[PDB]
Amino acid sequence: SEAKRLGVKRFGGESVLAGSIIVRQRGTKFHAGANVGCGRDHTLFAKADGKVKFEVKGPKNRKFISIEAE
Amino acid sequence: AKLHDYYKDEVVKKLMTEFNYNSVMQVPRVEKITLNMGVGEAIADKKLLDNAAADLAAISGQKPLITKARKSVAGFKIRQGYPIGCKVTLRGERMWEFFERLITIAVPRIRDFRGLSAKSFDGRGNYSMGVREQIIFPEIDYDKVDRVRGLDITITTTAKSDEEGRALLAAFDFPFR
Amino acid sequence: MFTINAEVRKEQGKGASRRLRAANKFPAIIYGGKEAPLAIELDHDKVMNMQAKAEFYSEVLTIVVDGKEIKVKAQDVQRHPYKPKLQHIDFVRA
Amino acid sequence: DKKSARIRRATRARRKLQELGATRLVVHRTPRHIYAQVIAPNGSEVLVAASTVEKAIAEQLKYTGNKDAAAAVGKAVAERALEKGIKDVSFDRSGFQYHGRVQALADAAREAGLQF
RNA sequence: ACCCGAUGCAAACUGCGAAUACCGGAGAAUGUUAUCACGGGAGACACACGGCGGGUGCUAACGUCCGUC
RNA sequence: CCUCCUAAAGAGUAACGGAGGAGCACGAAGGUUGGCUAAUCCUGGUCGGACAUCAGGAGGUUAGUGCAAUGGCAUAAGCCA
RNA sequence: UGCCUGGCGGCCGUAGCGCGGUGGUCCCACCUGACCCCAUGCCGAACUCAGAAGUGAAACGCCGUAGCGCCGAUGGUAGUGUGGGGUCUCCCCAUGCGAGAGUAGGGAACUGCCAGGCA
Secondary structure, eight states, X not given: OOOOOOEESSOTTOEEOXXXXXXXXXXXXXXXXXXXXXXXXXOEEBSSSEXXXXXXXXTTXXXXXXXXXX | OTTHHHIIIIIHHHHHHHHOOSSGGGSOOEEEEEEEEOOSOGGXXXXXXXXXXXXXXXXXXXXXXXXXXXXXXXXXXXOSSOEEEEEEOOOSSHHXXXXXXXXXXXXXXXXXXXXXXXXXXXXXXXXXXXXXXXXXSTTSXXXXXXSOOEEOOEXXXXXXSHHHHHHHHHHSOOOOO | OOEEOOOBOOOOSHHHXXXXXXXXXXXXXXXXXXXXXXXXXXXXXXHHHHHTSTTXXXXXXXXXXXXXXXXXXXXEEEEOSSSOOEEEEEEEOO | OOHHHHHHHHXXXXXXXXXTTOOEEEEEOOTTOOEEEEEOTTSSOEEXXXXXXXXXXXXXXXXXXXXXXXXXXHHHHXXXXXXXXXXXXXXXXXXXXXXXXXXXXXXXXXXXXXXX
């Protein structure tokens, strides 16, 4: 079977445009933060233009990916 | 709430004397009466369970709730989602009247009455029964009964301990063990 | 009670520990309290000689370095899997 | 329980509306008193607030918690908000059913002049 | 059986977890732009050996093949 | 065609390498609004044998999540209306 | 401004579990009846309508309790990038990066806004 595409495409500190795919995942390893969508395949994309940011939020220590506008 | 005044008059007072409590509500109360009729052998047909539910509704003032199998197992040949048990969910004013009627007339008419089983406690003040021959109630006639069911009343009580549960049972008659 | 004499450490890293082990010594540490812990060297010969008794982990040992005597206690010792050579010792000021 | 149940019920809507970063209006109920306040997107700041506890609203209320009291709280918050210039903030029920004093507050706020 | 203290191990176990490598942002120095795109012309299209991290085998094997130099 | 490693913490990466499944189905098993949240053990009892529905405590997702498996799901993506 | 109570955020166990004490000034909670706004796949169960009649019992605010969870060093080791060496199956050397595991120590939170009561 051909290997699927996983991992993070855009990492922290990277400037991205609207609609840019950040991370491809099967489940939800990371959760959308600010200005980040979530497709049917649990794919995170940036709804605006700005820098990527990774953080931890929530009582269960869940990883969150957000976009900060410049 | 017919028995509510009588309870507040006698039970609260005498429990206060016995337990030197501070506040009025510290005395154990009645949370609910779990009129649950677990036939267990309902696999034969649904009509037996329907008749049990009808009898429960006639005894109470509301339609009973039907409980299905919690999970599917092979040893007990029980599947998942199969309606098996029936219960009555009473929480209001009819509870006092029903309990008064029971403690008045349903207690003496027990075959081979050798005392209620006082050693059945969950561990914090819940008292359960496992008796049979539910024909004690005269509200049901012999012309509408096909077998003998079982009464497994398990009183949900605010008692904080087995000692408090025993004290409340003694307060509500409970002749002996 | 035992007088333990050593040299003040000046190099931090695994190189110093390897050099001491080659030279028949080994590193140790003295901590306990809010004061800055001090890294120290131990001479295998004398330290093993004094530790041959069962009082090493029982009585309060004395480090006399640069003419200064300080009381310490032994908590745990790192022992080599098979080689009979001491590796590292932790000391608590008590 | 009750408080944990209410918090877990409300958190979904609260966070979902927080994703939009929109100023909200929240109402808290209690058989004795009713509270209402406007919350900015940050969550650490408020714009307007009104409660049944204060005499300014309890003077003309026979009982602190009632339908008339809820209506008075709603109209008072709607006023304070329109003088402040909230400009059509959203509303949150804080995990409370929309068939009682919450509905009364919402109706009063909508009818006072707000377009939310 | 249940079952407390764990020992002996796990490529198809990880409540912990590196070093490297890849990714993006800022900066001096340095390199004959050493970087990218288009167009013309290709050649090759059975590689060998050695170092390192590996798979499997009979804890022999140039066994039986991979990623990097 | 899909899942585990293989596969050396980005992606990709071979071997008569070894492990399993599928050719679907659903007009609900989808959308919306609201409500709810398990496996197991113990305590109690007549069929109950040690493990039938039932009352409670611990447990806090080891359940469930249609497909074999992997990763996710409390906001539940699970259940009812 | 000092104490007490409720709501809304940051922080996501130094914020946790168990034990004791304390709380009705205000507020919060227990709960009365419900044909009235409400609805039960049955239930005033949830939610909603009429309190001070009593209380802080259960829940919850605060203080202690280091039994316990958790955070957590310094130091040593493992491990590894570049070069070299050997008995090159594996290990050692100069240099750089070097932590979980165990201890020292910390640990019964803190912070921003609004609202009510006692001062």
